[PDB]
Amino acid sequence: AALVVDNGSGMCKAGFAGDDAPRAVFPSIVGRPRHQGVMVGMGQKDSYVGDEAQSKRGILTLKYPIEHGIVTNWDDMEKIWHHTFYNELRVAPEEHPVLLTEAPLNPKANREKMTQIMFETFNTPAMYVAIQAVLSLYASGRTTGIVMDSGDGVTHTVPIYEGYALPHAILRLDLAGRDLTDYLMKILTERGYSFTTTAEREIVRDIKEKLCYVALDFEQEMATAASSSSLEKSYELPDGQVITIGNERFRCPEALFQPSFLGMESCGIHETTFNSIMKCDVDIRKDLYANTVLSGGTTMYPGIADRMQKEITALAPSTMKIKIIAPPERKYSVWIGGSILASLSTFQQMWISKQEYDESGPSIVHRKCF
Amino acid sequence: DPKYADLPGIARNEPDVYETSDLPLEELTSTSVEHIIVNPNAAYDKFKDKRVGTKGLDFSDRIGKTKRTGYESGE
Amino acid sequence: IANQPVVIDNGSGVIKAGFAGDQIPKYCFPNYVGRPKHVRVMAGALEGDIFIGPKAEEHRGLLSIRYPMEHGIVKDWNDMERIWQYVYSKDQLQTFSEEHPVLLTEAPLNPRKNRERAAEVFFETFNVPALFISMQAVLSLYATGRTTGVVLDSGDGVTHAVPIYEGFAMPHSIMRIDIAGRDVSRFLRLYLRKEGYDFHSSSEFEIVKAIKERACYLSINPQKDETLETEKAQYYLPDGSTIEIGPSRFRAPELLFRPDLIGEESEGIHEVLVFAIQKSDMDLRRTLFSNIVLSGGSTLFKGFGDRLLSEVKKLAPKDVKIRISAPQERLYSTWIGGSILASLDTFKKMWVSKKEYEEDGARSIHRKTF
Amino acid sequence: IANQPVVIDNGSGVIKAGFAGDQIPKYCFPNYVGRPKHVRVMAGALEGDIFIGPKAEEHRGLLSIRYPMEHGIVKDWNDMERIWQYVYSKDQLQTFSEEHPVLLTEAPLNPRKNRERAAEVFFETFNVPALFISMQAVLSLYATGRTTGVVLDSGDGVTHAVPIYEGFAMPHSIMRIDIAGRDVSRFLRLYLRKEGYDFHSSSEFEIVKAIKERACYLSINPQKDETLETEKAQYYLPDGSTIEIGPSRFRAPELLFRPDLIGEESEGIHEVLVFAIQKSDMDLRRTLFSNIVLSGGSTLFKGFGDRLLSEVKKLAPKDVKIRISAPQERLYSTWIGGSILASLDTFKKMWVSKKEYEEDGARSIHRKTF
């Protein structure tokens, strides 16, 4: 009996260890109302969380507590974890030990303060923080190979060979789902359809998930988009109003492969995956090309795998065979790994206990992280 | 001044600028290392009359004809 | 054609026209179409069903005001064509549009359909030699005569902050919010009804804009002025009747700096300025804080510069020099910039010729914009 | 030749240029090509798409930085051509390349293709009378005015140790390691992200280099200073914001002494020096240990001399006299050596003439360099 709780910037995936898929999946947001001095009606919650805030988007200002895999407002994150254990999962945190997930190369204060809350506020019996990328490999039953776990908050590239990780080869890029969502708003505003508010940004994320797809040749796709209106698809908003996004459909996910569009002055998700493999030892490169995994929900874009293969193959040597690993459950790839890890009898020892936390302090986490 | 006097919707008796109040080697002094004073004029004089023999010179990774020592002698 | 180019500012509230030779705009009239309020069947009433600028101001109470441009976007194009036709009337300028070339001043990050249709009208309806669409922010710097400078241009329709350093505008650091002078006029009408004076009519909305422009001061501390008993300064209406404004005077334009009070999800005028600087690169931040320029009519509020300086200082880093350099001609700054730009021989290269638009295509106007 | 020969110290971090005989290099500017990343909209902005040296330093925030040479190997030659062109331009020495001979200063044990291309550019693109390529270490000894000494030259790009006894330099005892000042700045950036301050931008990476030079001390005992709670020393960024560096201050420069931290299997700077002496013949070991000369900018770290003297003493034999001598101008020591060598009449014989290069080709340069 143990709890796996993925603390993703976009969506918080929580559930019991051993189960196939996560029990409760809700958007990680806190909804505070745009209140005036006028008195409010009955059935009023001071701050709404998750699926409740997703229902009452109209009035509530949606504030994401985790920004680029860094917890900015801890009071907000506490209210999400309270919604996770007590309401969503229907379980006491004192009974079950809780596994959390942190992105690699995050600030040290993040892991420090995270565990402090779990030990003091919720009074958990044991707490282990893990790297999202390390878990994602277990999903595919692969010990060897690199992963390109692109989330809503961040995208990170962690090469692991024969159950041994290369820490110095790890590269983090701040370009992620929320930056693409923010980019899609700007180009939709250029077409005509203006989306400004926090509630409207959530509707633009629903537009992104459904329509947007990765093009094989961007320049070739822009030529077809100009000539014919075949790529132009219609989407119905919450309001009866319908919109035809056009070429901006495949223009949004292009930003992943060339950040110049967003204006970050950084390497693309294809180029960073190559650079990470080159930073590793020369011998093991072979297996990393052969076992390139794509994880998170930012790798569920239709035809990212085809475009990824093409771009890596061009950069990589001709003799090498480049196979991209795209399992059907990419969105729940971080959690399903956690469920496999927590269930294993070996992992029982690796848990950090309250007694261990009390004596040493919150600094113990940095030793027993990975 | 007379240009802006002509127009109706102009700022009159307002300050133009709103501004804030105007607010007004450790290794090179180490014990371990011995601090030398570089005098190129002195250095130039010491090497002044020193020459090199560029005849039969080959520093390259050429195997032929045993070992070689570049810059044979002066004068 | 060598004949003098005609600058025209597309201000949502007031459009400012004139020749490039003039130091100031000779002809500037309100941007609204005036039709008779009662649907005219009979003779002896207001004839034509069109009253623009000074003719409208004379017979204002009889007519019904309808603004053609909202939030820096043209809603009714038929109305805008009549307005631009009145610019080339016997009343203002008194010239052929076919002879003189034109310069438009569209707000930043507007819809591309707005720019394309604006060009189509000015090339097809009027037989213009050449047209050039430009950004309102870039012009404001030419007027003042400095290359570096952030331009907080608070218009009637839109308030936007564009950072430009050494003649280089960062397009990602641009910030645009819809809460502008027109919204302040709308919110003042609500507070005037809370004082007990209704301005229900579209004509009666114009005198609320006059009340705002005459008497509305921005308090340095809003909470202290609320507790203090007001003088209740009397304003005289067109009919002759007096109205005591009282606390509505100062707590109306406050909604610029704090738009959450009414319940509008926006950043605020102090916030968009700071955010635009913070979004830009770290090296430039100090110089961009050291060079801020106020543009448009919604900066002329009494004690705007005093409040903004205080609200920017607390958000901005400590011990940083913040100079908010307002010109004396803030309302007419955007046009004067265009008048200088138009006069230069470089402008001859920048604009798009009528024959160029026929051959090149639609993109011609967009690609030459920058 | 009557015209003085120009000394150019082609350093990875800073390229130092000047005329032979001069006591100090008159014109020393940072080695990078700055291109504007933001768009030009206004007229009168900064002219050219290439900014090099002091103009690039002033307008750093506007530009995207790109180092042409990495680890003493010219990666992009087009860029290296533009910086050498800028040395001869009006801003720096302001003379024709055809009239003055050149003295280039490359690092030891660099690729042969680098020396070949370096010559090709300096003879074809610039029609120079004569070029001599020399080692950095050999010059550093002429500056101090000593015939016997080992030269530990820790530069920005590469750190190397060359044992030189009574004029002769032992080519098999040369020790070179890629880990250097620029890897310390790269390793500092990684630890600053762990502390929770991000510097993703190429312009922001130059601020990390500024933080390194100002606030980073090498602790005499590494394991001792790790455990003890450190005083969190605040540093002021260009914008004004304060960062607490904390443990990253002293952990960052330790990379030079322990290359295992970044994860490269190479010798430490302390191991490089002793290995270079131990590789030399038995008789000269005592004289080389007595005569140690530190060079390059990366030796200017606070407590470098103290730590190195501690580390060398443990690896070196018992009861041997270890005197580490520092010239006050460590940074400019390499160039001053070049000026003294260039001023001697013996340098005339050492040169490769244009005709000599044109006849034999690449071989002539490889024959006469060390």
Ligand SMILES: Nc1ncnc2c1ncn2[C@@H]1O[C@H](COP(=O)(O)OP(=O)(O)OP(=O)(O)O)[C@@H](O)[C@H]1O
């Ligand atoms: N099918 C899809 N196609 C395209 N984009 C998607 C799709 N599903 C989700 N996304 C986008 O990618 C993000 C994926 O978030 P996800 O559910 O993987 O959680 P997360 O916060 O990224 O967690 P983690 O970092 O642990 O992977 C969403 O926020 C959304 O913006």
Ligand SMILES: Nc1ncnc2c1ncn2[C@@H]1O[C@H](COP(=O)(O)OP(=O)(O)O)[C@@H](O)[C@H]1O
């Ligand atoms: N003297 C003034 N005091 C206060 N508000 C003013 C004043 N003059 C104009 N305004 C406000 O500013 C608006 C004018 O905006 P304007 O500068 O013409 O915008 P644009 O830059 O788009 O042309 C008016 O409609 C009014 O709301």
Ligand SMILES: Nc1ncnc2c1ncn2[C@@H]1O[C@H](COP(=O)(O)OP(=O)(O)O)[C@@H](O)[C@H]1O
């Ligand atoms: N005061 C300082 N403290 C620490 N490191 C420094 C200091 N000054 C310069 N450096 C480092 O030394 C570098 C300069 O290298 P330099 O000696 O000019 O190279 P080269 O010897 O290859 O010509 C800088 O880029 C920086 O990384």
